Amino acid sequence: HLNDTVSKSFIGRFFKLEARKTTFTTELRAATATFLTMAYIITVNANILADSGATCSINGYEQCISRVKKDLVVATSLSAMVGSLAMGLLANLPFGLAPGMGANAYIAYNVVGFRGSGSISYHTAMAIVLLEGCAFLAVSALGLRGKLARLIPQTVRLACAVGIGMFIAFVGLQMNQGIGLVGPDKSTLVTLTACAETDPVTGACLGGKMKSPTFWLAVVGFLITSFGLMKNVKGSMIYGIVFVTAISWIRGTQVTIFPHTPLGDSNYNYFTKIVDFHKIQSTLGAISFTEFRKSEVWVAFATLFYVDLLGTTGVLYTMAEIGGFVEDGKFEGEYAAYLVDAGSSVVGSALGVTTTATFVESSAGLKEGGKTGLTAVIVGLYFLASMFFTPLVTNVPRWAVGPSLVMVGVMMMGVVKDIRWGETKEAVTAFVTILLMPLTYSIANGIIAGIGIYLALSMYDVVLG
C-alpha cells in the first residue's frame, strides 16, 4: 500500500503520479541505474581538473595537488546535485544533469595546459565558463534554443549520442584514467600495450604485452559487471567496482594503491577514518576578470560558445525523444528545461567545475520506465552521499572505473539502429560524426564535421530552393 497511500498526498499531485502513471517500486530504485551509471564523474572529473591544478601555482604534489583533488571531488558532487535537484523540482523530467566530459579535457589541456603550461590561467578559464553560462541564460530566456532544437537534423543528433558513448569508452582504455590497454607507437599511432614495466611519462613499454597484473583485475571487474547485468540484478555497476576496490585496498600486493612512498602513507593515513566532511576551502570563488583584455582569451570563447550551444541542445531533445515525451515537435516543461541547463552552469563556475551538459545516461533509467519526476530528485539526493564519504571516494584506484566507463559506451549503442543507413545523403554524415569523435579525442570535432558535411551536400537543393 506504499503506492496506494502516497497517491493521496501532495507528492502524488505535484509530480502528477496519476497521469503518465508509474509506481514507487518502479521509481525509487529503478532509477538508481542513472546514479550507478553517472557515479564515475565524481572521480574522473576530479582527476582531469587535478593535473591542470587551478590552485597553488608555481609561486608540491603532497600539499597542493591532494588538497585540490579533495576540494574538486566535493565541488563535482555538489554541482551535479544542484542541477539534478533543479530539474526534478520544476519541469518534471527524468534527467541527470552533471558536469560533462567534453569540456574537461579541452580546458585542462588545450586552454590551461598541463600543470599550468599554457598562456591562459585559472582566472580567465573559469571566467569564460561563467560568461558563457550567463550568455546561455539570455539565449534560453527569449526562447531561441527552443526553436533551434528542432533545426538540427535527426541523424546528426543521434550520431552525436553514439559518438559520445564511443569517446567515453575510448577515454577508459588509455593509461591516464583507464585500464591501460592503448598506448603510443611510432609507425602507427595506437597499439595494445598492457605492459607491466611502464615508463611513468607515457604509455610506452619496457617489458609487458599483456602480463600486467592490474589489467587482469579490471577485466575481472568488467566480467562481473557484464554477468550481473544479465539476469537483471537490481544494481551491478557498483558490484564490479567494490570488488576491485576492496582487493586493491589490501596492503603489500603488487596491485595496491597504498605504496611505501612518503605520499602513500598520507592517503592511507586519511583512509583510516571512514567519515569526513572537508568543506571546500581553496576552490570556491577564484573568478577574476583581469586578463580578458587581449585577443587570446576572446578566441577561446568563440570557439566554445557555438559548439556548446550545438552539442548540449541536441542531447536534451534526444533524451526527450527516447522517453516519448515529444509528440508534435514540443514537450512539456521545455521552457524551464532549457533554462535549468544554463542556471546549473553559472552556479558551477563559482565552485570550480566546468560546464554542465545534461548527462546522456538517463537511457538506463528510462529503460526501466521513469516517466514522471521524482527521478532527478532521487539522483540529487544520492549525490548528497558522495560528499559525506570523501575518504572512500578519493581513494578509488583509477583502474576501477574503466570497466564502468566502457560499459557507458556499450549501453549507448542501441540507438544506432534508428539511424537511416539506407540512404547515402543521411549516412555519410552519421558515419563521419561517429568516427571523428574517438580518433580525434574531442567531441567538439564531431558536431562541427557533421554539420559541415550535411550543410555541404545539400546546397544544390538550397541554391535551387
Ligand X SMILES: C/C(=C\CNc1ncnc2[nH]cnc12)CO
Q: Which residues bind its own copies (CB under 8 A)?
A: 105, 109, 114, 166, 169-170, 173-174, 181-192, 202-203, 223, 226-227, 229-230, 409-410, 413-414, 416-417, 421-425, 427-428, 431, 435, 438-442, 445, 456-457, 460
In the complex, minimum distance from the CB of residue 7 to its own copies, in angstroms, rounded to a whole number? 33
3-state helix, strand, coil in the chain (%, to 5): 55, 5, 40
Whichever of 40 and 338 has its CB closer to its own copies, that residue is 40
Contacted by 101, from its own copies, ligand X, none: CB < 5 to 8 Å by type: ligand X
Shortest Cβ 331–ligand X spacing (Å): 18
Work out whether strand 205-207 and strand 197-198 pair parallel, antiparallel, or are unpaired: antiparallel
**409 touches, from its own copies, ligand X, none (C-beta below 5 to 8 Å by class):** its own copies
Helix, coil or strand: residue 389: strand
Residue 312 binding target from its own copies, ligand X, none, CB below 5 to 8 Å by type? ligand X
- Nearer to its own copies by Cβ, of 185 and 291: the residue is 185
Under 8 Å CB-to-CB from 455, ≥6 apart: which residues? none
The answer to whether 85 touches 374, Cβ cutoff 8 Å, is: no
Minimum distance of its own copies from residue 431's CB (angstroms): 5
In whole angstroms, what is the distance from residue 411 CA to residue 152 CA?
Answer: 24
Q: Which is nearer to its own copies, 206 or 230 (CB)?
A: 230
**Rounded least distance, CB 410 to its own copies, Å:** 5
Which is nearer to its own copies, 140 or 198 (by Cβ)? 198
308 binds, among its own copies, ligand X, none (CB under 5 to 8 A by kind): ligand X
Q: In this complex, which beta carbon is closest to ligand X, that of residue 395 or of residue 445?
A: 445
Q: Mapping DSSP to helix (H, G, I), strand (E, B) and coil, where does residue 34 land?
A: helix
| Residue 315 touches which of ligand X, its own copies, none (Cβ within 5-8 Å per kind) | ligand X
CB of 181 to its own copies, least distance (A): 8
- Which of residues 119 and 440 has its CB atom nearest to its own copies in the complex? 440
Which residue, 71 or 341, has its beta carbon nearer to ligand X? 341
CA proximity to 320, closest of 333, 304, 306: 333
Q: Which is nearer to ligand X, 153 or 203 (CB)?
A: 153
Task: For residue 340, count CB atoms less than 10 angstroms from its CB and return exposed for 0-12, middle for 13-18, buried for 19 or more.
Answer: buried
103 binds, among its own copies, ligand X, none (CB under 5 to 8 A by kind): ligand X
User: CB of residue 189 vs its own copies: minimum separation in angstroms?
Assistant: 6
> Which of its own copies, ligand X, none does residue 154 bind to, with CB < 5 to 8 Å depending on kind?
none
CA distances from 87 to 84, 142, 193 (A): 5, 19, 43
Distance CA 48, CA 398 (A): 12
Footprint of ligand X on this chain (CB under 6 A)?
Answer: 100-103, 164, 168, 307-308, 311-312, 315, 357-360, 443-444
**Contact of residue 357 among ligand X, its own copies, none (CB under 5-8 Å per partner type):** ligand X
**Residue 118 CB neighbours (<10 A):** 16
> Which cell is 62 given?
603532497
Q: How far apart are CA 359 and CA 33, in angstroms?
A: 13
What's the grid cell of residue 253?
Answer: 600486493
Q: Which residues are within 8 A (CB) of 143 and not within 5 positions of it... i.e. 6 or more apart?
A: 335
Rounded Cα distance, 347 and 75, in Å: 11
Nearer to its own copies by Cβ, of 88 and 172: the residue is: 172
Positive or negative CA dihedral for 398, 161, 51, 284?
negative
Residue 100 binding: pick among ligand X, its own copies, none (C-beta 5-8 Å cut-off by kind):
ligand X
Least distance CB 433 / ligand X (angstroms): 12
Query: Any bridge partners for residue 114, and if so which?
Result: 117
Comparing CB distances to ligand X, the nearer of 50 and 257 is 50
Whole-number CA gyration radius for the chain: 22
Q: Taking CB positions, which residue lies at the least distance from ligand X?
A: 102
Closest distance to ligand X from the beta carbon of 355 (Å): 7
Report the partner that residue 57 touches, choosing among ligand X, its own copies, none (CB closer than 5 to 8 A by kind).
none
CB of 39 to ligand X, least distance (A): 13
Please state the length of the chain: 465
Contacts of 195 (CB under 8 A, 6+ apart): 183, 205, 206, 207, 208, 209, 211, 212
Please say which residue, 17 or 449, places its beta carbon nearer to ligand X: 449
Give 22's DSSP letter.
-
Name 184's bridge partners: 190
Strand 190-192 relative to strand 182-184, pairing:
antiparallel
Number of H helices, E strands in the chain: 20, 4
The answer to whether residues 51 and 115 touch, using CB atoms and an 8 Å cutoff, is: yes
CB of 416 to its own copies, least distance (A): 6
> What is the smallest separation between the CB atom of 432 and its own copies, expressed in angstroms?
8
For residue 442, the partner it binds in its own copies, ligand X, none, with Cβ less than 5 to 8 A by kind, is its own copies
